[PDB]
């Protein structure tokens, strides 16, 4: 689990990374070192049982989003991150973990290496991964692969600057399923 939480670089949320963990006792003691700006929220499971229940296969999904977007990483949620980047199912059994990463993932100029999808023709299915860079046609005229009127680049960078308020700072997220 250290190789996921302590990973030097996380993924962009439109291109979220999935690690299968198998035959591991899950030492959650790594999570105590992430206090003081840590959202931990479990669904279908007690957080306390995760230490003892060695699930034969866990998926650890990992990505970066804004602080105000962390609330969209839950079952039944809607919004640009939930609908077009990372959807959980409504019967989701597992755990959402998110911590402030502003010291690692911001720069004074802005860090722009983290992206998100801002437009898609339809919402994602649960755990669907859309990495496509095709021009989003909002209009009734073909884009022909060119950005223009009703013709948008589907991905956008954030901006992660150290001086931004907590809701605009980068949060590293790990979802366990």
């Amino acid at each position: 689990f250290d190789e996921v939480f302590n990973a030097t670089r996380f993924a962009s949320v439109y291109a979220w990374n999935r690690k299968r963990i198998s035959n591991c006792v899950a030492d959650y003691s790594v999570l105590y070192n992430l206090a003081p700006f840590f959202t931990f929220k479990c669904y279908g499971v007690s957080p306390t049982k995760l230490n003892d229940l060695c699930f034969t296969n866990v998926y650890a999904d990992s990505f970066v989003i804004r602080g105000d977007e962390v609330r969209q990483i839950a079952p039944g949620q809607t919004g640009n991150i939930a609908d077009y980047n990372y959807k959980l199912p409504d019967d989701f059994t597992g755990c959402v973990i998110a911590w402030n990463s502003n010291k690692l993932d911001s720069k004074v100029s802005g860090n722009y290496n983290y992206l998100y999808r801002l437009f898609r023709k339809s919402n994602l299915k649960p755990f669907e991964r859309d990495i496509s860079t095709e021009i989003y046609q909002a209009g009734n005229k073909p884009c022909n692969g060119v950005a223009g009127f009703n013709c948008y680049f589907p991905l956008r960078s954030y901006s992660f600057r150290p001086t931004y308020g907590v809701g605009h700072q980068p949060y590293r997220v790990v979802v366990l399923s």
Partner: antibody
Framework: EVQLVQSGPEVKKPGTSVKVACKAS?????????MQWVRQARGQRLEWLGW????????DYAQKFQERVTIIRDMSTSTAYMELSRLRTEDTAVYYC????????????????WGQGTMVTV | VLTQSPGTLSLSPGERATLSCRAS???????LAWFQQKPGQAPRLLIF???SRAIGIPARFSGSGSGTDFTLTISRLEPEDFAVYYC?????????FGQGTKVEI
């Protein structure tokens, strides 16, 4: 209904700046809508100033007024602003905002919703 | 550059107006637009995408043309149609209007 509500009339001196507001209602700024700025001096043609994407925040400007004009948005109040610096007497015009009637995942192919206009006098 | 013709068009109610727009040196005309403007009012869209009618625009209005040459036709003038008409190009930055055509009684 979608509506654009502009700020009231402005009287300025030459060399100063003006900042016209446009508050949009009835649609979310989450949609990739172009809000545009157009002016009309009395009895003159329409002049396009520039635009802003209401979802990404990317702007572009007509080359004649590219250095002075700055278009911005506030996502929290659903308000675009057009700021015009280094004002001249020739900048005396009704400034309009305009936007296409857009939906969650689909836009119209023409710009049909206009604000009522803001008279700027210089 | 868009050039409209005529500059003024005097016509009775019930007559057919026909208004030209010519695109000059450059084209790429794929998002063409057409507007009515009344005194003291903002411009209202009549036709978009060369010929597609705007919502709530009467069936007497029709747009046509491609490449360099475009036309707005009003098949039977009504007293509310006496106004200045403007064409406007797109995907051709700066997004230029024509100079207008005044329709009057």
């Amino acid at each position: 209904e979608v509506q654009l509500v502009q700020s009231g009339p402005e009287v300025k001196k030459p060399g100063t700046s003006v900042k016209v507001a446009c508050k949009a209602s009835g649609f979310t700024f989450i949609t990739p809508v172009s809000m545009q700025w157009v002016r009309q001096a009395r009895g003159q043609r329409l002049e396009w100033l520039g635009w802003i994407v209401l979802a990404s925040g990317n702007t572009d400007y007509a080359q004649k007024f590219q250095e002075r004009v700055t278009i911005i948005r506030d996502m929290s109040t659903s308000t675009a602003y057009m700021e015009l610096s280094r004002l001249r007497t020739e900048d005396t015009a009704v400034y309009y905002c305009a936007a296409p009637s857009c939906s969650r995942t689909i836009c119209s192919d023409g710009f049909d919703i206009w604000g009522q206009g803001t008279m700027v006098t210089v | 550059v868009l050039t409209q013709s005529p500059g003024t068009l005097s016509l009775s109610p019930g007559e057919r107006a026909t208004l030209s727009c010519r695109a000059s040196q450059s084209v790429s005309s794929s998002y063409l637009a057409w507007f009515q403007q009344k005194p003291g009012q903002a411009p209202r869209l009549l036709i978009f995408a060369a010929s597609s009618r705007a919502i709530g625009i009467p069936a007497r209005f029709s747009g046509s043309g491609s490449g360099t040459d475009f036309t707005l036709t009003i098949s039977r003038l009504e007293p509310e149609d006496f106004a200045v008409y403007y064409c406007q190009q797109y995907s051709s930055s700066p997004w230029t209007f024509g100079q207008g055509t005044k329709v009057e009684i």
